[PDB]
Nucleic acid binder design. Structure first.
Ligand code: NA
Length: 92
DNA sequence: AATAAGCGGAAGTGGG
DNA sequence: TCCCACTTCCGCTTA
């Protein structure tokens, strides 16, 4: 099954949910979710995974928090809804 | 207060 | 057995 970081990188590459997520500085791997439209993207993540419950942005961000300990995706301090893929993730 | 978001421990579920 | 990669639940904190 696809991993969350790959789902997000794939969305950013395809542009299929451009009103829910976008690059801020793609060379640095920084991206941001839409305050008003992030739930639609969270719903899609849960459906792609086949999870029992409806996925929410909060539960998705809880998963993203675990990536911050390992560095796969860092949450930018002093900003809202803004994250940064590691260099390794961006290399493919 | 209402709303939004951050924070994160702990326990539950998948698939090895 | 026991870790993976989240998911779900709960509650406190900050804005
Ligand atoms: Na536990």
């Amino acid at each position: 099954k696809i991993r969350l970081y790959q789902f997000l990188l794939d969305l950013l590459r395809s542009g299929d949910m451009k009103d829910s997520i976008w690059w801020v500085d793609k060379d640095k791997g920084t991206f941001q979710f839409s305050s008003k439209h992030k739930e639609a993207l969270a719903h899609r993540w849960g459906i792609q995974k086949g999870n029992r419950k409806k996925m929410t942005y909060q539960k998705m961000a809880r998963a993203l928090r675990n990536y911050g300990k390992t560095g796969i995706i860092h949450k930018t301090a002093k900003k809202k809804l803004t994250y940064q893929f590691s260099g390794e993730v961006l290399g493919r």
